[PDB]
Amino acid sequence: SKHFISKKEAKRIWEQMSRYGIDITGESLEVAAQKSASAYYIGGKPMVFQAGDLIPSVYLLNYRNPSRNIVTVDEGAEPHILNGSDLFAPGIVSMDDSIRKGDMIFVKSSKGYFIAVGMAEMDAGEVMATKRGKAARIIHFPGDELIRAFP
Ligand SMILES: [Zn+2]
C-alpha cells in the first residue's frame, strides 16, 4: 500500500517542509493513504502527514529540526501536550517572537526534543506579555490518530 514517489513529487514535499526550515531535500519518500489523510515515509517512519495541511510528524521534527515557529513548554505541560491537550500560555517557557495567530507551531520539551505540532491561537507578543489564555491547539502528537493510522 506504499509507493516510492518520483523525484519531482518528492521535491514538492521537500519545499513545503523547507518553509519551516525542516530540511529533507534529497530524501526519497514513500506515500500511503487512508483517503482521510496520506503519509510520506522516510526509512519506514511516517514523516509528513497530509491531513488538511501538510504536517510534519513528531519523528520528522526530531530528525530534522525546524528553524522557526518553535515553542518551548515546561515540565508540567509536557505530559498533557503528549496526550493532545491544548497548550496554555502559563506553560510556555519561550517561543519564536514572529509567531502569529494561525501559524503552525512546533512544540518542544525544555529538554530539547519535539513533542507536538500545533496551530497558534495567539500572537507571540500577547502570550509573552500576559502568560494567560489558550496559546495553541495541538493537531499532532505521539500516538495520535495519524500515527495509529500510519504505522
Ligand atoms: Zn493528559
- Asked if 33 and 97 sit in the same domain, the reply is no
Closest CA relative to residue 50, chosen from 4, 17, 86: 17
Q: In which element (H, E) is residue 116 found? A: strand 114-120
- Asked if 142 and 114 sit in the same domain, the reply is yes
The 3-state DSSP class for residue 50 equals strand
Q: Measured in angstroms, how far is the CA atom of residue 86 from the centroid of ligand 1?
A: 10
Q: Measured in angstroms, how far is the CA atom of residue 7 from the centroid of ligand 1?
A: 40
Q: How was this structure determined?
A: X-ray
Boundary residue ending a domain (65, 94, 110): 65
- 94 is written with which cell numbers? 519561550
- 31 is written with which cell numbers? 506515500
Sorted by sequence, the CB contacts under 8 Å of residue 67 that are 6+ apart come out as 20, 21, 22
- Asked if 71 and 144 sit in the same domain, the reply is yes
The 3-state DSSP class for residue 12 equals helix
Closest CA relative to residue 47, chosen from 24, 77, 70: 24
Q: Measured in angstroms, how far is the CA atom of residue 111 from the centroid of ligand 1?
A: 19
Domain count, the chain: 2
- Asked if 43 and 99 sit in the same domain, the reply is no
List the resolution, Å. Answer: 2.1
Q: Measured in angstroms, how far is the CA atom of residue 84 from the centroid of ligand 1?
A: 7
Domain region containing 27: 1-65
